[PDB]
Amino acid sequence: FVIVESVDPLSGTCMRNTVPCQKRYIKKCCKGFCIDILKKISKSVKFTYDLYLVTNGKHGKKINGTWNGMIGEVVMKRAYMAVGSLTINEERSEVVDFSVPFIETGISVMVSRSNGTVSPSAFLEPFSACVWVMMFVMLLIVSAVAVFVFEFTIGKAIWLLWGLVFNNSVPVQNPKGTTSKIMVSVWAFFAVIFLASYTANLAAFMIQEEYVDQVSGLSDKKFQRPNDFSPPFRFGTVPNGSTERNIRNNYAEMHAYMGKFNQRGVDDALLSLKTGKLDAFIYDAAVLNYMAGRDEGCKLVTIGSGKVFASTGYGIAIQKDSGWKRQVDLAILQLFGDGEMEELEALWLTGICHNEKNEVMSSQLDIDNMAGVFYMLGAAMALSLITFISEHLFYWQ
Amino acid sequence: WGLVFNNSVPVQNPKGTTSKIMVSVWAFFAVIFLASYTANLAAFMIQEE
Amino acid sequence: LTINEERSEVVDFSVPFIETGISVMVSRSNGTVSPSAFLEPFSACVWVM
Amino acid sequence: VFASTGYGIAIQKDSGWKRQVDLAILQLFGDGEMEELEALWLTGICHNE
Amino acid sequence: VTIHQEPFVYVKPTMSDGTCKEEFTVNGDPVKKVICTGPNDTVPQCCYGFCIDLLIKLARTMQFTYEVHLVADGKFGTQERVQNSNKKEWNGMMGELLSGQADMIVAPLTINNERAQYIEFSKPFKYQGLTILVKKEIPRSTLDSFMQPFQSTLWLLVGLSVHVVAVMLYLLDRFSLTLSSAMWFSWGVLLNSGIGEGAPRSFSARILGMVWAGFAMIIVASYTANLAAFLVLDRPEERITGINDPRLRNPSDKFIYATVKQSSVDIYFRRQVELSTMYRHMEKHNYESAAEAIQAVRDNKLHAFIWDSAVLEFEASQKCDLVTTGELFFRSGFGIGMRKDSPWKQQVSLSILKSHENGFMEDLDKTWVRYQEC
Amino acid sequence: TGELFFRSGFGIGMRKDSPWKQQVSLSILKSHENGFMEDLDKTWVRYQECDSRSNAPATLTCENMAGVFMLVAGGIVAGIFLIFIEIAYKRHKDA
């Protein structure tokens, strides 16, 4: 949202478009997009602008009786207008005048996209009951020729036709019928193409990615039940969180609990993500979109795909009933007008990570979770056991 | 060589049980050679010209 | 038009506005990889094992 | 490239604009407004080379 | 005069005394050579290249004895600011043309709008451009796959699960070998290797046959899925965006990206506005020697470099690990020295006219361009 | 479409001046502040029927799967009718 450094001592001071600001009062340059939005502001409104440092804690937020921050200085009237990007809280709104949206915003959380694929048995999912269709179908058709051989045992031969169905691999008792042999030739190339059906099925397994992890919204089974998860699911922002305060109004399962998971530092959130000691992280939504946007490597992902949580937007507020008030947001209007914001995607928004479509590749070994297909496979053991001992009951009477 | 190629050799399984496990050598291995044909076919589908 | 040597020899011309050259073109239609590229994946390892 | 070349706007031998004209071309490549002109012309919808 | 550039030319110290390696081509063409003088960092050494060859043919049209000199400074040349007196300093071989120290200095340092009003130029010898020198990573990603990257423990897990399976079949046996004929049997259900002993005819038996059947069926299927995993695969982001490159457009200390010190390309970056980023960063990062760029990539020294694009495309052969850039950046061209006025002027233009008109250019591709290894 | 084009927004009529003005603003403040917006997604937004693909995860295939194996089973009964009289060919020849 904003950028700054020390004014370059090589030339002695700032360069490029950097805008200086004093700090107790040491002038220092500032960079970043919304700064340039302020540039474009006087680029019509024509009001001189001199940047200044912020003392503590972002914008003004109610501290004891008063907002602590930039909007505090607004209450202090320390400036005609204010800069910096925070979606105005109803409180912040109720405090004093604010701007029109500079860019969209919202509540959000994020974490590292790491490991998972498609869940097990998706191969079986490709069958689409056609496996059953031709299963019973070709079964009865097999019985048909079995009867046609006149010129249990034939049932066992149908089991051989199930080897014809499944991977051959049935050594027992080829039937003498030559017409029945061509009957095997029916399932030969056909069922061969059913092995092919398994092939392309496996392709769509490899193809048709998913990229889905847990996001339930403002709460979750892993959130609305904060103490339930054996490993703690940690997501949230740093102290004095405005959006957190909204959550502090919303649900206490975190504002209560997340104080535990509470952390410090802005990028230090992404750093702890590199540590990954905590499940996830929440921060300014679109800002977080820049967090994934600037990524040394591909790890993190927004909680959700960007489905908006507490959709919002920021801007440059000023005092209640200020001078620029009316036509200011109009300057914002034209600002959206020329598309120079779309240009500012360069200046800020457009990321190197991007690829919000591309999910990359989950390729890895077979998972026990992925082996769950074989789990449901082996599950039928006790079932066939129930049928078998059931036949023993058929032998009781 | 049927063990090498797609099984499909009906004739004369050897009685050797140690030899049977010897067949088990080419079993999963050569199975993964069929897999070699698989991925091979992928690079056929993949790796355009 | 790219100035021919003739066109050049005719009279003064400009500096390049954009690159150019001789070219031909046709419809890309049908073909794949040539046959046996599957066998091409073997890389003699099929012979090795 | 077959017979690589390029076009431009020629004028008469020893014309008025002659010298600094191609210089105007030079700055023209300078600002990158040609890269913009990919829109005006060059950049294609087919693309996908 | 010029600077040693392998893609442009092959110029090494002389062989013995007035001597260089005498070799015909791989096509048997005996490519000529010539000797220019320079210090090792001021004496004659060997010089050859398809470019310099094009110089030779250039004389072969309009005859002038070709004197081979080398460059003194490292750069090509630019009108530049001195340290005092506020007087225009045209640098490099360009300055040598201001010095007139030669006839026409061959060089592929593209025609500069700055150098334009200063120095004359001809049509492009080889139409070319500049871009970012990059080196690709080494794709491997392979494994023993079905062995290695397939169900590491789980393959074994289902393995003993087959033991419990044949166990279940043995349970299905006694309600009307059992261990052993199963040790062949269900193990075959794993192998499908056709031992050929048999399978029980019990009502539950063949059902279990369908069970382990579909099981291993989907198992080998999963092996194929692994084959795709080896085949289809991420090969993650290669960056290489362009003049809009966000990593570039997002200045930080992580990526080391720059171009040559005093580079006509970096000159295209010199007069600019939005370019101010690398105009700061890369500037302090700018190495002088593009050879040091070749080795730097061989060293993986920086995260990125930039130089004449076509040149790199040639160097791409010299490096198996190189990474070509995405597209063209501000195409332009260069050639033999053009300044003041010469009878060689309109003539030389016509020489170019023959050059592209004829194929001795496209022929020379064999001498240089068409030559390819990587 | 591919991406956003010149995002902006609208709402109830706003003109001249009304006590409804700053009030209504605060109403919005509750709106996004509360979830009755996000709730209303269920009333409208969250309501969804048509699925969303990118590639063609057709893996089901059962219709076209029948589109091969079904008529193939046509080839199966082709010996029920054919291999009948064929089973009577050499047989009936020697009958």
Swiss-Prot record, chain D:
<protein>
    <recommendedName>
        <fullName>Glutamate receptor ionotropic, NMDA 2B</fullName>
    </recommendedName>
</protein>
<comment type="similarity">
    <text>Belongs to the glutamate-gated ion channel (TC 1.A.10.1) family. NR2B/GRIN2B subfamily.</text>
</comment>
<comment type="function">
    <text>Component of N-methyl-D-aspartate (NMDA) receptors (NMDARs) that function as heterotetrameric, ligand-gated cation channels with high calcium permeability and voltage-dependent block by Mg(2+). Participates in synaptic plasticity for learning and memory formation by contributing to the long-term depression (LTD) of hippocampus membrane currents. Channel activation requires binding of the neurotransmitter L-glutamate to the GluN2 subunit, glycine or D-serine binding to the GluN1 subunit, plus membrane depolarization to eliminate channel inhibition by Mg(2+).</text>
</comment>
<comment type="subunit">
    <text>Heterotetramer. Forms heterotetrameric channels composed of two GluN1/zeta subunits (GRIN1), and two identical GluN2/epsilon subunits (GRIN2A, GRIN2B, GRIN2C or GRIN2D) or GluN3 subunits (GRIN3A or GRIN3B) (in vitro). Can also form heterotetrameric channels that contain at least two GluN1 subunits and at least two different GluN2 subunits (or a combination of one GluN2 and one GluN3 subunits) (in vitro). In vivo, the subunit composition may depend on the expression levels of the different subunits. Found in a complex with GRIN1, GRIN3A and PPP2CB. Found in a complex with GRIN1 and GRIN3B.</text>
</comment>
Swiss-Prot record, chain E:
<feature type="disulfide bond">
    <location>
        <begin position="320"/>
        <end position="374"/>
    </location>
</feature>
<feature type="glycosylation site" description="N-linked (GlcNAc...) asparagine">
    <location>
        <position position="40"/>
    </location>
</feature>
<feature type="region of interest" description="Pore-forming">
    <location>
        <begin position="179"/>
        <end position="200"/>
    </location>
</feature>
<feature type="binding site">
    <location>
        <position position="110"/>
    </location>
    <ligand>
        <name>glycine</name>
    </ligand>
</feature>
<feature type="disulfide bond">
    <location>
        <begin position="36"/>
        <end position="47"/>
    </location>
</feature>
<feature type="binding site">
    <location>
        <position position="115"/>
    </location>
    <ligand>
        <name>glycine</name>
    </ligand>
</feature>
<protein>
    <recommendedName>
        <fullName>Glutamate receptor ionotropic, NMDA 1</fullName>
    </recommendedName>
</protein>
<feature type="topological domain" description="Extracellular">
    <location>
        <begin position="224"/>
        <end position="374"/>
    </location>
</feature>
<feature type="binding site">
    <location>
        <position position="308"/>
    </location>
    <ligand>
        <name>glycine</name>
    </ligand>
</feature>
<feature type="binding site">
    <location>
        <position position="108"/>
    </location>
    <ligand>
        <name>glycine</name>
    </ligand>
</feature>
<feature type="binding site">
    <location>
        <position position="264"/>
    </location>
    <ligand>
        <name>glycine</name>
    </ligand>
</feature>
<feature type="intramembrane region" description="Discontinuously helical">
    <location>
        <begin position="179"/>
        <end position="200"/>
    </location>
</feature>
<feature type="glycosylation site" description="N-linked (GlcNAc...) asparagine">
    <location>
        <position position="83"/>
    </location>
</feature>
<feature type="transmembrane region" description="Helical">
    <location>
        <begin position="152"/>
        <end position="172"/>
    </location>
</feature>
<feature type="glycosylation site" description="N-linked (GlcNAc...) asparagine">
    <location>
        <position position="347"/>
    </location>
</feature>
<comment type="similarity">
    <text>Belongs to the glutamate-gated ion channel (TC 1.A.10.1) family. NR1/GRIN1 subfamily.</text>
</comment>
<feature type="topological domain" description="Cytoplasmic">
    <location>
        <begin position="201"/>
        <end position="206"/>
    </location>
</feature>
<comment type="function">
    <text>Component of N-methyl-D-aspartate (NMDA) receptors (NMDARs) that function as heterotetrameric, ligand-gated cation channels with high calcium permeability and voltage-dependent block by Mg(2+). NMDARs participate in synaptic plasticity for learning and memory formation by contributing to the long-term potentiation (LTP). Channel activation requires binding of the neurotransmitter L-glutamate to the GluN2 subunit, glycine or D-serine binding to the GluN1 subunit, plus membrane depolarization to eliminate channel inhibition by Mg(2+).</text>
</comment>
<feature type="transmembrane region" description="Helical">
    <location>
        <begin position="207"/>
        <end position="223"/>
    </location>
</feature>
<feature type="glycosylation site" description="N-linked (GlcNAc...) asparagine">
    <location>
        <position position="250"/>
    </location>
</feature>
<feature type="glycosylation site" description="N-linked (GlcNAc...) asparagine">
    <location>
        <position position="63"/>
    </location>
</feature>
<feature type="disulfide bond">
    <location>
        <begin position="20"/>
        <end position="46"/>
    </location>
</feature>
